[PDB]
Amino acid sequence: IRLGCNVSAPSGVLERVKELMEDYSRAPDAKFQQQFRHLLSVNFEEFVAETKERNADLDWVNPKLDERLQLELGQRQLEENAKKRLEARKKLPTMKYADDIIQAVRENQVILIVGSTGCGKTTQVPQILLDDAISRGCASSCRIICTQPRRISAIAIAEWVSYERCESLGNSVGYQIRLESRKARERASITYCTTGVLLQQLQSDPLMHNLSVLILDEIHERSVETDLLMGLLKVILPHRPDLKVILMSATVREQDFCDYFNNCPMFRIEGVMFPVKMLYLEDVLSKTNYEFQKRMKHEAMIEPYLRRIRNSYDSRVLDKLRLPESEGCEDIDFIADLVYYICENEPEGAILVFLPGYDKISQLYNILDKPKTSKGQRWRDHMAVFPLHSLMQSGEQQAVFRRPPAGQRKVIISTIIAETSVTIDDVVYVINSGRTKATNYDIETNIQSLDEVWVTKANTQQRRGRAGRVRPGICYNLFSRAREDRMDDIPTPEILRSKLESIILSLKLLHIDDPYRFLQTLINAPNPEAIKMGVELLKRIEALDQTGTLTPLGMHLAKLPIDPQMGKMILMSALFCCLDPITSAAAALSFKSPFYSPLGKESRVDEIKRRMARNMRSDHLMVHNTIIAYRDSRYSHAERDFCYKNFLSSMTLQQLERMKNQFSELLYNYKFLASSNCKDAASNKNSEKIPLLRAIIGAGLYPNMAHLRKSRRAIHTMATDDGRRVNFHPSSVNSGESGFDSAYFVYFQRQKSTDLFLLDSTMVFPMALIIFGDGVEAGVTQNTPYLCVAKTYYFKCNRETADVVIQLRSNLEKLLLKKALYPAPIEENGYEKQLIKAIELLLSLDERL
DNA sequence: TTGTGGTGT
């Protein structure tokens, strides 16, 4: 055992802490206690009955509305706005099947519609089912929900389908996503939403009584939400005979879904696209004759393929495919030559180059921008080059989407972001390096890593169509055809890679009490070791009790749109009056940092972060400071200048602000706050006290802790509580810093790439860890009296302080248990406020003099 | 000294 610094407190302070605890301990309407007890008392049978009663609205129809819409449809079909738009809609493949689709839905509860881009299924299939019900004079009985993986999809598809109907948004077509909606009318309507919205609405309506038609789209992409929803439909659909489901998929393991729902009807709908010629590494080295130079394994794969094709390609081509570095992005200069080649031959069109990461995007960018070769210098001023990465500004500006200046060919160097989330319409030529990066989590060693990997067959299939949007394109694949056959079908479904805390807890509100029983029924069942490890985390933060049942705290957390650890942090912040800074830190960890990282500006950006951090040694507080500065710039009408100087995304910042206000209102709705403004003065009386902030930030991120032993920019010896060596990720404001007031840090995310990195961190103090943590005991190890936390970090503490801190932790526990069962804001002068003021005092001892 | 991508009445 190694002993750390002294946490003992002066007599005057311990005297006051004790006086305050005694005030608190002298204390003597909850609908929520009734709601919580009622959830736990019903079995599943009673749960299904009761929800049927509260969501009855769709048992009611409006014949005057049925008729009036039946009438306005037939009437407006003779006008000239429609009948051209009906006629151009009849050009889409999906419409050929309308009557066969209507019949399949009528005769079956679940059916599957399989089709690729341009078949129109997403825009057309809702309109078909809706205009049918209108025409038969049912319009008021028809309410259609169509889920989408991505926010942008949901809006744009909803604006489009609305235009096709000669209506503004908000009438028969609407969209709802997180914190934004243009809702359609209540009946006879189509609603596009993100898959997550539909899941949250299950809490109020777990059997989907408020919809007549559910349409899941892009289920082949295997997002966590659509996998969950399909599992949950196996539970729901037996109790909902009148409910109609349409599954929708690309042709990517489409049988998996047809299998999963009995053997249900499957429509295949032919695509609309310009053909994109597929070439491989043999075909590229055949055209450009590029020459390489500056395990095997690889020899075992390629040689058998070379034999079958030996008379279809030159012997020097086949000899190049034997080089390990011929495949992928290992040689950037090779890719550079391919871009130059397409500039020389081939018609005008944009090149989209798929490389795995930020590192490789910079390399090709520098080679294309500052060319060393003569051919590159020829082409340099004739290319308009956009790097495209989730961290770079180009995605959020207008340039990369528009066609380039005349005489310039647009070359986009992108990550997998250009596969779906971001689409550029003028791309005619796709260079697919075949390499992407992946996050893997090893459950055994508890290390998440970020590794370069080969893409899957589905990735390549998708990237090919990115060349076929405008005219016939070409897709250049920088791997052999032999590699393709070794590639997996689809990427590992997201749920097999994901932390299960949030899902497990969420199921409890749906009266799915056994996560092992339920999660096993998905298309791909998660490792039960991941389920257990999720249950254990929820038990650790006391969202589930020892027998695994929901606690009152856990029902609250289950009701916040954030992971349960950060939901708990936000609650603490209400009780401890730091609401504005803590919700900023919470919102940024859930979504993302506002900082761009443009090419070449890295150190300029490390400077801006360090500046905004205001020497507080916290990535999380640093973001809040940024949001404070952002707000002040709008009050100053300086906003746009402010975002340019500091390399900040205004789209991200406004989104953080929306998330924060959402957490404000929910907590105010739950009676933890007196005001739904996250800037409200009562809620923020502590928001200036930085040790209190670090304590609450730590309360959320515990138990992720690190200890720093070294010196030198500076060099760091640091290890997590598990013993493993780590460093601050170079993008964290703590990288290379020295002169920390404390040797302890908490972090949200640890990731292995070229080292074991803490992606984000806050400097914390031992007294805060002890109060809000667990594994606390007092003792004597050598001849020193100690106080520990997590049975890991042992601190010198005299006995008077240990006996107070431990009495303090008991009262804090008793308090939280009360506040969760009987929600009500902490009264400013009451008994509860005394215990808060006791903790404020003890934590304030670590203030910087 | 370095960062695949989604998302939550």
PDB file of N, CA and C in Angstrom, chain A residues 346-398:
ATOM      1  N   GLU A 346     -11.116  10.536 -68.963  1.00  0.00           N
ATOM      2  CA  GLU A 346     -12.438  10.537 -68.339  1.00  0.00           C
ATOM      3  C   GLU A 346     -13.150  11.884 -68.463  1.00  0.00           C
ATOM      4  N   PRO A 347     -14.476  11.868 -68.548  1.00  0.00           N
ATOM      5  CA  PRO A 347     -15.251  13.118 -68.631  1.00  0.00           C
ATOM      6  C   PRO A 347     -15.249  13.864 -67.308  1.00  0.00           C
ATOM      7  N   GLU A 348     -15.753  15.088 -67.362  1.00  0.00           N
ATOM      8  CA  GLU A 348     -15.893  15.874 -66.146  1.00  0.00           C
ATOM      9  C   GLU A 348     -16.816  15.198 -65.130  1.00  0.00           C
ATOM     10  N   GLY A 349     -16.411  15.266 -63.864  1.00  0.00           N
ATOM     11  CA  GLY A 349     -17.169  14.752 -62.744  1.00  0.00           C
ATOM     12  C   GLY A 349     -16.317  14.821 -61.494  1.00  0.00           C
ATOM     13  N   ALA A 350     -16.939  14.767 -60.318  1.00  0.00           N
ATOM     14  CA  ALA A 350     -16.196  14.887 -59.070  1.00  0.00           C
ATOM     15  C   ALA A 350     -15.613  13.544 -58.644  1.00  0.00           C
ATOM     16  N   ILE A 351     -14.466  13.587 -57.979  1.00  0.00           N
ATOM     17  CA  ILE A 351     -13.877  12.389 -57.385  1.00  0.00           C
ATOM     18  C   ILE A 351     -14.109  12.409 -55.882  1.00  0.00           C
ATOM     19  N   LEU A 352     -14.676  11.329 -55.366  1.00  0.00           N
ATOM     20  CA  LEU A 352     -14.829  11.116 -53.937  1.00  0.00           C
ATOM     21  C   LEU A 352     -13.859  10.021 -53.524  1.00  0.00           C
ATOM     22  N   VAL A 353     -12.883  10.358 -52.687  1.00  0.00           N
ATOM     23  CA  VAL A 353     -11.835   9.421 -52.271  1.00  0.00           C
ATOM     24  C   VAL A 353     -12.065   8.991 -50.830  1.00  0.00           C
ATOM     25  N   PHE A 354     -12.300   7.707 -50.623  1.00  0.00           N
ATOM     26  CA  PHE A 354     -12.560   7.183 -49.293  1.00  0.00           C
ATOM     27  C   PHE A 354     -11.265   6.687 -48.674  1.00  0.00           C
ATOM     28  N   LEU A 355     -10.819   7.367 -47.632  1.00  0.00           N
ATOM     29  CA  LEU A 355      -9.676   6.956 -46.842  1.00  0.00           C
ATOM     30  C   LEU A 355     -10.133   6.710 -45.410  1.00  0.00           C
ATOM     31  N   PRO A 356      -9.386   5.919 -44.630  1.00  0.00           N
ATOM     32  CA  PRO A 356      -9.886   5.556 -43.290  1.00  0.00           C
ATOM     33  C   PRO A 356      -9.996   6.712 -42.291  1.00  0.00           C
ATOM     34  N   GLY A 357      -9.034   7.626 -42.213  1.00  0.00           N
ATOM     35  CA  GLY A 357      -9.048   8.511 -41.071  1.00  0.00           C
ATOM     36  C   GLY A 357      -8.487   9.893 -41.337  1.00  0.00           C
ATOM     37  N   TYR A 358      -8.433  10.687 -40.262  1.00  0.00           N
ATOM     38  CA  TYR A 358      -7.865  12.029 -40.320  1.00  0.00           C
ATOM     39  C   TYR A 358      -6.430  11.985 -40.817  1.00  0.00           C
ATOM     40  N   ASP A 359      -5.643  11.039 -40.295  1.00  0.00           N
ATOM     41  CA  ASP A 359      -4.241  10.901 -40.678  1.00  0.00           C
ATOM     42  C   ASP A 359      -4.078  10.751 -42.185  1.00  0.00           C
ATOM     43  N   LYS A 360      -4.752   9.764 -42.768  1.00  0.00           N
ATOM     44  CA  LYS A 360      -4.609   9.524 -44.200  1.00  0.00           C
ATOM     45  C   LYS A 360      -5.217  10.646 -45.041  1.00  0.00           C
ATOM     46  N   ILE A 361      -6.247  11.337 -44.540  1.00  0.00           N
ATOM     47  CA  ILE A 361      -6.817  12.437 -45.306  1.00  0.00           C
ATOM     48  C   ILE A 361      -5.825  13.579 -45.421  1.00  0.00           C
ATOM     49  N   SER A 362      -5.109  13.882 -44.336  1.00  0.00           N
ATOM     50  CA  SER A 362      -4.086  14.918 -44.401  1.00  0.00           C
ATOM     51  C   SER A 362      -3.012  14.564 -45.414  1.00  0.00           C
ATOM     52  N   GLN A 363      -2.610  13.291 -45.460  1.00  0.00           N
ATOM     53  CA  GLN A 363      -1.500  12.908 -46.321  1.00  0.00           C
ATOM     54  C   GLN A 363      -1.836  13.178 -47.775  1.00  0.00           C
ATOM     55  N   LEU A 364      -2.952  12.615 -48.254  1.00  0.00           N
ATOM     56  CA  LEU A 364      -3.392  12.860 -49.626  1.00  0.00           C
ATOM     57  C   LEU A 364      -3.633  14.344 -49.887  1.00  0.00           C
ATOM     58  N   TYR A 365      -4.185  15.058 -48.907  1.00  0.00           N
ATOM     59  CA  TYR A 365      -4.406  16.489 -49.080  1.00  0.00           C
ATOM     60  C   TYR A 365      -3.092  17.212 -49.338  1.00  0.00           C
ATOM     61  N   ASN A 366      -2.060  16.890 -48.558  1.00  0.00           N
ATOM     62  CA  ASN A 366      -0.804  17.602 -48.705  1.00  0.00           C
ATOM     63  C   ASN A 366      -0.137  17.245 -50.023  1.00  0.00           C
ATOM     64  N   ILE A 367      -0.225  15.979 -50.414  1.00  0.00           N
ATOM     65  CA  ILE A 367       0.323  15.546 -51.689  1.00  0.00           C
ATOM     66  C   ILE A 367      -0.407  16.209 -52.850  1.00  0.00           C
ATOM     67  N   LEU A 368      -1.734  16.301 -52.786  1.00  0.00           N
ATOM     68  CA  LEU A 368      -2.450  16.982 -53.863  1.00  0.00           C
ATOM     69  C   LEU A 368      -2.244  18.499 -53.836  1.00  0.00           C
ATOM     70  N   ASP A 369      -2.117  19.105 -52.642  1.00  0.00           N
ATOM     71  CA  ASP A 369      -2.066  20.567 -52.495  1.00  0.00           C
ATOM     72  C   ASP A 369      -0.673  21.141 -52.705  1.00  0.00           C
ATOM     73  N   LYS A 370       0.349  20.440 -52.214  1.00  0.00           N
ATOM     74  CA  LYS A 370       1.741  20.873 -52.299  1.00  0.00           C
ATOM     75  C   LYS A 370       2.497  19.760 -53.012  1.00  0.00           C
ATOM     76  N   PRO A 371       2.211  19.561 -54.300  1.00  0.00           N
ATOM     77  CA  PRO A 371       2.714  18.372 -55.000  1.00  0.00           C
ATOM     78  C   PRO A 371       4.217  18.439 -55.225  1.00  0.00           C
ATOM     79  N   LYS A 372       4.896  17.341 -54.906  1.00  0.00           N
ATOM     80  CA  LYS A 372       6.314  17.168 -55.196  1.00  0.00           C
ATOM     81  C   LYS A 372       6.562  16.646 -56.609  1.00  0.00           C
ATOM     82  N   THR A 373       5.699  15.765 -57.118  1.00  0.00           N
ATOM     83  CA  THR A 373       5.849  15.266 -58.481  1.00  0.00           C
ATOM     84  C   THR A 373       5.491  16.339 -59.510  1.00  0.00           C
ATOM     85  N   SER A 374       5.979  16.118 -60.736  1.00  0.00           N
ATOM     86  CA  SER A 374       5.745  17.062 -61.826  1.00  0.00           C
ATOM     87  C   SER A 374       4.301  16.998 -62.323  1.00  0.00           C
ATOM     88  N   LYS A 375       3.758  15.780 -62.473  1.00  0.00           N
ATOM     89  CA  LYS A 375       2.357  15.615 -62.868  1.00  0.00           C
ATOM     90  C   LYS A 375       1.403  16.280 -61.879  1.00  0.00           C
ATOM     91  N   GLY A 376       1.730  16.230 -60.584  1.00  0.00           N
ATOM     92  CA  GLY A 376       0.885  16.887 -59.603  1.00  0.00           C
ATOM     93  C   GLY A 376       0.927  18.395 -59.723  1.00  0.00           C
ATOM     94  N   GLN A 377       2.125  18.951 -59.944  1.00  0.00           N
ATOM     95  CA  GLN A 377       2.245  20.388 -60.158  1.00  0.00           C
ATOM     96  C   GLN A 377       1.469  20.817 -61.394  1.00  0.00           C
ATOM     97  N   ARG A 378       1.405  19.949 -62.409  1.00  0.00           N
ATOM     98  CA  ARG A 378       0.580  20.244 -63.573  1.00  0.00           C
ATOM     99  C   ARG A 378      -0.877  20.427 -63.169  1.00  0.00           C
ATOM    100  N   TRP A 379      -1.387  19.516 -62.336  1.00  0.00           N
ATOM    101  CA  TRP A 379      -2.807  19.464 -62.015  1.00  0.00           C
ATOM    102  C   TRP A 379      -3.198  20.352 -60.834  1.00  0.00           C
ATOM    103  N   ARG A 380      -2.224  20.825 -60.043  1.00  0.00           N
ATOM    104  CA  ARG A 380      -2.542  21.370 -58.730  1.00  0.00           C
ATOM    105  C   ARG A 380      -3.636  22.433 -58.827  1.00  0.00           C
ATOM    106  N   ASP A 381      -3.419  23.474 -59.632  1.00  0.00           N
ATOM    107  CA  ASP A 381      -4.406  24.552 -59.671  1.00  0.00           C
ATOM    108  C   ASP A 381      -5.680  24.166 -60.401  1.00  0.00           C
ATOM    109  N   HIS A 382      -5.759  22.972 -60.987  1.00  0.00           N
ATOM    110  CA  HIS A 382      -6.968  22.542 -61.683  1.00  0.00           C
ATOM    111  C   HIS A 382      -7.873  21.632 -60.848  1.00  0.00           C
ATOM    112  N   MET A 383      -7.537  21.399 -59.581  1.00  0.00           N
ATOM    113  CA  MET A 383      -8.375  20.649 -58.656  1.00  0.00           C
ATOM    114  C   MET A 383      -8.899  21.577 -57.558  1.00  0.00           C
ATOM    115  N   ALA A 384     -10.178  21.440 -57.237  1.00  0.00           N
ATOM    116  CA  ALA A 384     -10.769  22.047 -56.049  1.00  0.00           C
ATOM    117  C   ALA A 384     -10.902  20.949 -55.000  1.00  0.00           C
ATOM    118  N   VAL A 385     -10.065  21.016 -53.958  1.00  0.00           N
ATOM    119  CA  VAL A 385      -9.860  19.921 -53.015  1.00  0.00           C
ATOM    120  C   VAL A 385     -10.537  20.237 -51.690  1.00  0.00           C
ATOM    121  N   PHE A 386     -11.493  19.390 -51.304  1.00  0.00           N
ATOM    122  CA  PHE A 386     -12.194  19.465 -50.024  1.00  0.00           C
ATOM    123  C   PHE A 386     -11.849  18.245 -49.177  1.00  0.00           C
ATOM    124  N   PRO A 387     -11.194  18.373 -48.014  1.00  0.00           N
ATOM    125  CA  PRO A 387     -11.182  17.264 -47.053  1.00  0.00           C
ATOM    126  C   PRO A 387     -12.506  17.227 -46.317  1.00  0.00           C
ATOM    127  N   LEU A 388     -13.038  16.018 -46.118  1.00  0.00           N
ATOM    128  CA  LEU A 388     -14.361  15.827 -45.518  1.00  0.00           C
ATOM    129  C   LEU A 388     -14.254  14.856 -44.344  1.00  0.00           C
ATOM    130  N   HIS A 389     -14.514  15.359 -43.138  1.00  0.00           N
ATOM    131  CA  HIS A 389     -14.344  14.607 -41.903  1.00  0.00           C
ATOM    132  C   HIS A 389     -15.287  15.187 -40.865  1.00  0.00           C
ATOM    133  N   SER A 390     -15.799  14.335 -39.976  1.00  0.00           N
ATOM    134  CA  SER A 390     -16.806  14.804 -39.019  1.00  0.00           C
ATOM    135  C   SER A 390     -16.305  15.962 -38.153  1.00  0.00           C
ATOM    136  N   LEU A 391     -14.987  16.112 -38.022  1.00  0.00           N
ATOM    137  CA  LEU A 391     -14.304  17.140 -37.249  1.00  0.00           C
ATOM    138  C   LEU A 391     -13.904  18.364 -38.060  1.00  0.00           C
ATOM    139  N   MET A 392     -14.177  18.391 -39.356  1.00  0.00           N
ATOM    140  CA  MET A 392     -13.715  19.466 -40.215  1.00  0.00           C
ATOM    141  C   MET A 392     -14.899  20.309 -40.659  1.00  0.00           C
ATOM    142  N   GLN A 393     -14.629  21.572 -40.998  1.00  0.00           N
ATOM    143  CA  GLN A 393     -15.759  22.454 -41.221  1.00  0.00           C
ATOM    144  C   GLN A 393     -16.480  22.187 -42.541  1.00  0.00           C
ATOM    145  N   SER A 394     -15.795  21.615 -43.541  1.00  0.00           N
ATOM    146  CA  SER A 394     -16.353  21.541 -44.894  1.00  0.00           C
ATOM    147  C   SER A 394     -17.753  20.912 -44.927  1.00  0.00           C
ATOM    148  N   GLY A 395     -18.022  19.908 -44.084  1.00  0.00           N
ATOM    149  CA  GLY A 395     -19.356  19.327 -44.080  1.00  0.00           C
ATOM    150  C   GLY A 395     -20.456  20.330 -43.770  1.00  0.00           C
ATOM    151  N   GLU A 396     -20.147  21.349 -42.967  1.00  0.00           N
ATOM    152  CA  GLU A 396     -21.106  22.336 -42.475  1.00  0.00           C
ATOM    153  C   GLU A 396     -21.149  23.633 -43.290  1.00  0.00           C
ATOM    154  N   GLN A 397     -20.399  23.714 -44.385  1.00  0.00           N
ATOM    155  CA  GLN A 397     -20.456  24.825 -45.327  1.00  0.00           C
ATOM    156  C   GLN A 397     -21.027  24.356 -46.659  1.00  0.00           C
ATOM    157  N   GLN A 398     -21.246  25.328 -47.553  1.00  0.00           N
ATOM    158  CA  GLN A 398     -21.952  25.113 -48.812  1.00  0.00           C
ATOM    159  C   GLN A 398     -21.046  24.683 -49.962  1.00  0.00           C
TER     160      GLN A 398
END
